[PDB]
Design a protein around this ligand. Structure first.
Ligand SMILES: [Zn+2]
Ligand SMILES: [Zn+2]
Lengths: 200, 200
DNA sequence: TATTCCGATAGTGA
DNA sequence: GTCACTATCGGAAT
């Protein structure tokens, strides 16, 4: 099944150059279809935990949540900032980049192996091809890793999000269902953010 | 306006080789986007009648209706059969062709100059490109010229027809909204009809 | 809400 | 229900 496509990264990380980190516990791998300039996946290698739904992970597996956050903010932090500088600009400091990165799970992932998204905010990417892509990362469907448990969405409830009008995440401008127009505007927003960020 | 596109044929039929007949009263012209193998338009040149709605023509202009029918069955009859043989097959007799030709108005034409469609039944044509095309010629939206007045549709009432599932005019097979599949089937139906018709 | 391919659907401009 | 262009929307296979 296509839904098991990610299992090869946790089973044989030694085989993939796009696996930019692995140890006995986790794998950090580049998303094959990046939905922002930088888009990485952090995957547990635990044979049981990998098949636990991310909302259940957030609710009842706080040790794993803390462990993943610890990887992101510690041992993988330098690596992630270098990936971001290569994907965006060498001229961007850790401080600028940290405020331009989000980390979270999809509330309804299609792939069955638990994967934590670590990505830049731009959503400027050739692989961003439709409204559902965009909405999945910019609505409550994207469950940020620091969401309090009492604020988690209920499994299966967010279907209707995907039919809503499009709004730019940065400035709030609306685009109805005109995805192509949104796309062009996201480019502009990135150009703007970059100019402002390097200008210090 | 694009809606006045046909007026050139009644104003200056002398200028167009695809005007296959003209006199002081009418013009017979090839449809520029034929929706069957043969698709002709018979147009009154009368400055007033040309802008009368076809349903009003059918209801209250019986002399013009009779005159158009007289052209079709009389002085233009040989011409129409030749067009049909060239468009379909030389091997088809007048008798076979007469049962494979329909004559009628659209209940809601876009073009403003009154035009009577004279066309073969096949609907096999590169210009037949969507469901609305097909439905416009095979439903009550196509008002056959011999429709009794008491059985005419009311102006503006047939909008909903265009959303219905597709059915083959010849054998009744249904295709949902799969237009491409209908198209392929119409080809087959034409091949079948042709084989049967020349086989005397 | 995995991608990709095809095709139906919708709005516009002329 | 003029055409033609663009883009959105929808199902199916993988
Ligand atoms: Zn914006
Ligand atoms: Zn049929």
């Amino acid at each position: 099944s296509f839904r098991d496509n990610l299992k090869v990264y946790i089973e044989s990380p030694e085989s993939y150059k796009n696996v930019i980190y692995y140890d006995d516990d986790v794998v950090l791998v580049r998303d094959m279809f990046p939905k922002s300039k930088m888009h990485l996946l952090l995957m547990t290698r635990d044979p049981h935990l990998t098949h636990v739904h991310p909302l259940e992970i957030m609710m009842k597996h706080r040790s794993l949540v803390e462990k993943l956050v610890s990887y992101v903010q510690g041992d993988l932090s330098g690596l992630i900032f270098d990936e971001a500088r290569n994907c965006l600009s060498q001229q961007l400091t850790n401080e600028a980049l940290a405020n331009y990165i989000k980390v979270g799970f999809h509330a309804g992932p299609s792939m069955n192996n638990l994967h934590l998204h670590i990505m830049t905010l731009d959503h400027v990417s050739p692989s961003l091809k439709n409204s559902a892509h965009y909405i999945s990362f910019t609505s409550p469907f994207f469950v940020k890793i620091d969401t309090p448990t009492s604020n988690l969405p209920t499994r299966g409830t967010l279907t209707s999000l995907f039919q809503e009008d499009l709004k730019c995440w940065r400035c709030g401008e609306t685009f109805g269902r005109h995805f192509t127009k949104l796309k062009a505007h996201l480019q502009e927003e990135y150009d703007d953010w970059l100019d402002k960020s390097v200008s210090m």
